Symmetry: C3
Subunit: 487 residues, 3 copies
């Protein structure tokens, strides 16, 4: 006829994704990305972090020198992996404040040990027992020196070890608790007395407690493990009359990124910045639901199993009509575009500048959210195997508080980001419509269905001029006004 229809609209897909917003909880979008990492590879990767596989050893067993842990002497790690199927196979022992010594060594990151010559005179060195078998022979912990009487005497030891280095020295020592008085005399030839280990800054006094304990590996006695840190310029003084499991030297304390994790996952040859007890995970997504226990440049742990961030506009499946009534399922070149009815025929073209503007805004939002990780190393324990009381309750409370707060932040962030993304794509659709209306001026009317009725003869070249912003409204003003406002 003497008019034409130019409809503006946007693409749609047959199978969209349901996302949450502020306005609604179940709104369909054309595309979305998952922001919660919900699965692991099942293996701990050797790179980029140095992984020390504990095998059958615990970190403390490796520290003390348990005969099965000889392969752990002087090792370094970024993450120590402690296996569930691990056990002591040496003299029964315990550690008051076990969690603290384990934390100290895991944080330090090394078992580097330097032997020192202690003046252990008047006593017999290198005591052994059938509990600790090293090479089919009776042994003891490789980093401890079990001192016993010499010729039925155990003279009081007053042994000085100055710290003349520029680093802190970690000394591991213990106290033997015999299972009977007969053992106390056999090994030390005198009453228990007490052991005092002191520095200029601190002191520790431990008394032996002789008596039977349930046998562990047929041993009715125990060794208690104690430690001390000697600062540069300080002096370690050990005063003992018996029952001393002496240090053979010191371990270095380092500051660093090292930690310990409990995991039965195998260790494999892959590169992954994040490590969890379930194995390494990708750290692209901002959130994870694999484990609360993490090491490295990991995503933050949330309770939500899935959070999907819209990466497209509202999906609205389906004469010509535009964005007000529905989306266009026949558009594959871009997100926004034009469809028209002319004298020559019907056609369609995408508006690639508006499409890219919407994509760049989405890309910017994804860039702020994706690839930004939070690198954490030594942290509190999050899983417990014993009922300890007030301190464990506080550690659980702190972790649950952190998880609830980050889950809230993730839920609010995703709902705000999805509401904003929809608003951005609606704004781009509306800007394209307003641009077209302003370009057409008085030569077209808004039909209320996202289309313009053009009141002058319009060919495909004219539509092309409109689409790329080169339409001259004055050339057609007289025809359009005569048709629009009948005279």
């Amino acid at each position: 006829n003497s008019t034409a229809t130019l409809c503006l609209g946007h693409h749609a897909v047959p199978n969209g994704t349901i996302v949450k917003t502020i306005t609604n909880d179940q709104i369909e979008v054309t595309n979305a990305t998952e922001l919660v990492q919900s699965s692991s590879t099942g293996e701990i990767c050797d790179s980029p972090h140095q992984i020390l596989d504990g095998k059958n050893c615990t970190l403390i067993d490796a520290l003390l020198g348990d005969p099965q842990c000889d392969g752990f002497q002087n090792k370094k790690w970024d993450l120590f992996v402690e296996r569930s199927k691990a056990y002591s196979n040496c003299f029964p022992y315990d550690v008051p404040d076990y969690a603290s010594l384990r934390s100290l060594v895991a944080s330090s990151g090394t078992l580097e040990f330097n032997n020192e010559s202690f003046n252990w005179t008047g006593v017999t060195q290198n005591g052994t027992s059938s509990a600790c078998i090293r090479r089919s022979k009776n042994s003891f912990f490789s980093r401890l020196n079990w001192l016993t009487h010499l010729n039925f005497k155990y003279p009081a030891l007053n042994v000085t070890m100055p710290n003349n280095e520029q680093f802190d020295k970690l000394y591991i020592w213990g106290v033997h608790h015999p299972g009977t008085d007969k053992d106390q005399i056999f090994l030390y030839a005198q009453a228990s007395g007490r052991i005092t280990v002191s520095t200029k800054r601190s002191q520790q006094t431990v008394s032996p407690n002789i008596g039977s304990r349930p046998r562990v590996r047929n041993i009715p006695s125990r060794i208690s493990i104690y430690w001390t840190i000697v600062k540069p310029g300080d002096i370690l003084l050990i005063n003992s009359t018996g029952n001393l499991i002496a240090p053979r030297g010191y371990f270095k304390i380092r500051s660093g990124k090292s930690s310990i994790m409990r995991s039965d996952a195998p260790i494999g040859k892959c590169n992954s910045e994040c490590i969890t007890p379930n194995g390494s995970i990708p750290n692209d997504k901002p959130f994870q639901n694999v484990n609360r226990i993490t090491y490295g440049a990991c995503p933050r742990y949330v309770k939500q199993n899935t959070l999907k961030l819209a990466t497209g506009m509202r999906n609205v499946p389906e004469a010509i009509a535009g964005f007000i009534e529905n989306g266009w399922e026949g558009m594959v070149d871009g997100w926004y575009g034009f469809r028209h009815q002319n004298s020559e025929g019907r056609g369609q073209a995408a508006d690639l500048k508006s499409t890219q503007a919407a994509i760049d805004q989405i890309n910017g939002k994804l860039n702020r959210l994706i690839g930004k990780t939070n690198e954490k190393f030594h942290q509190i324990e999050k899983e417990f195997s014993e009922v300890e009381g007030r301190i464990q309750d506080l550690e659980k409370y702190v972790e649950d508080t952190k998880i609830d707060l980050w889950s809230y932040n993730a839920e609010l962030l995703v709902a705000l980001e999805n509401q904003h993304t929809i608003d951005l794509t609606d704004s781009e659709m509306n800007k394209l419509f307003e641009k077209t209306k302003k370009q057409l001026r008085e030569n077209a009317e808004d039909m209320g269905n996202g289309c313009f009725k053009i009141y002058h003869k319009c060919d495909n070249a004219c539509i092309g001029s409109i689409r790329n912003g080169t339409y001259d409204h004055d050339v057609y003003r007289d025809e359009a006004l005569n048709n629009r406002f009948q005279i």
Copy 2:
């Protein structure tokens, strides 16, 4: 007249509510709902949680078997309620790590106790004291066995109790600290030694400390309470030469939805998921300002006394003018609507579809905020009666940090939700205006007061057609253009 005026507007109320938004701290709205529960009912509900009223007893007194607490033997609970007017009325005692044992038992949720045939030979069982009167005669704690000499002899005990069950056993035992050497000899016939209670996994050694304490209920001596947890497959060994307040058996350790609260509120016949020290509270609102100490599906504690969530549009009290100049007080059928002046007279009708769309979006937000309360049980202590130091300070810091962060989240959430509520109601008013404008095409002009001037004669049926969305602009186009563009 040859023309008519069709005005669009929205309701207003004589008494609005002041809410906060991001843009303005004090915006008046037609309606708002409180999101902070600031008052309790004053009573603790018997349902749905099992409530154990401690009456005159603390949890530890019920655990030990204080005579006034005999009514709590073998009881179970979901929440143990500890009264301020509670006191011990038995032998004076203390508990190292009292908070840990109280938490441990409260978390377990039961006083179920199984007696065991301990081989307490060579000693006299069931010692009593005048401090503990049961049935008007001298007694002792019902779950403790005060062992004394037999015929002026107290042979060393080496008593083994294997754990052959599939569950952990909690053994409660103590150490008697006589107030004089005469009591130590009178009761045990020998000087004090040490008590060692050990397992394959752990050991505890406690020495008696003879000496006077300020008398409590006329007793100068004290009992210290210790506990041990025996895992399946382990063995309990009690090694003692005197001063042992022996277990009579064990308590079962459970893990579940159980805790302890200090409260003086009465307990009554009601059903409420959330229990606070001030009594049960409703759990419909997302936040509460009653107490930081809660149990069950409770709203999160915030510092704000009030937070009002807008549930309506901004209140703008009042020929005809629309939403740009004011709201309409005289409209009760809906939130959005029309007023007109035509050839027949004045009139008004509400637009019910826009009203419902706004309401549905508000109800969506309300459903997101209301009734989504998260359920928490055993947590940490938040109120303290004694000055303890570093651990109490950390617990207070953790709770204050949590409260400040949730108060921030509540303030930001309400300001964002109220700003969004205003934006949605303004968007619905604007959408109704744009819809009307598009329906009218060139037959009407925007007068800048929220009204359209229609340039053709209108009857009530025509205005109704416009409200319905059935208005045909072509049958009126020639009249409206001849009048609208008259020179």
Copy 3:
């Protein structure tokens, strides 16, 4: 001519500021303000808080009565400032739980001490040491009483001190751990022994551990410090056979806005509510990056080095054209305005009401961020000089969690406020444009460049009438319609 052009637009500046929004990481705005305090004055301000400079003393040395701390006796403070240069010069000692006693006293906020007469009979009072020189004479801690034998006997002490007051009494006492057995006999005339200090509610039993330790200031022995809190109506009972460093009275326990801070900053004559280890800082900004350790009405600590809050509109550098194509670099009277071309030359005038509306919304926003501060006093230790284990790990975890969450809140808040600010200035520009369009009705067309083409001769009086909202579209309707549609 027969037509006129009336353009609407907004100002621009030669050089704006880059801020973050939700939509983009770097948007240029005409003005922005810093919300993170990144520097201190270098001095601790004298008021409003009561500041006690520890000089060469620690809080514990001041508590015990170290000779260098006599000037701190019976003092009160809101903030105790502990210097990194502080050192002890008295008998060597330790505290089994040093952090708890230091926190306890710092929280109490006072060294007020009330002497009590204890029945220390049969023993020698006021023992001294060459380690603690007060006036060129051997002395001891001024709040401790080193008891020794009398005539080579130390009878067992059973000393009762009832609490008949209405407040909690803090008793500081200790145990001497001699360096050998000769010291134990020389001082107490008997080996070993045990000290029990008890109340109705609790008891503490400490054994001396005789033996050498590394010499500190030439003293091979140590004193361990213990404390007891006695509630009103309770009794302090001290039972000792030797090695007792007795109390001389009690310290009052209070509850209030008091704490302790470690800092080497000097104390000035400044008045500032917020104190950090680096010195006091302004507390006007909602956030700070000076230190995680704060006292008083301080901004919250964030990791961000800077956060800029837009305080103006987007900066769009600059026939005539309006806001769709460019801003106006030549408009310095307001933020929004009109520029016109008619037969009588060209001109410009600012729209003062839209400018003020945008400013009022921004000032409202600033009042929600600036000044409002959360005041905190005693907290937790955030920096450590020793490797302690599980408790230190938890304290660090809690503080890092708090910082990460507040840094998140600060980034989200600033991005939301900047995106909203941009939306506010775009909305005000669009509202002024729509207002003009509604006033002009059919007498003008929107040219798509932020300007209106008016189809009737619009003189400076017509354009002034339009700018102030007094334009009558009917007066010019016949001319404008004849020029526009014919």
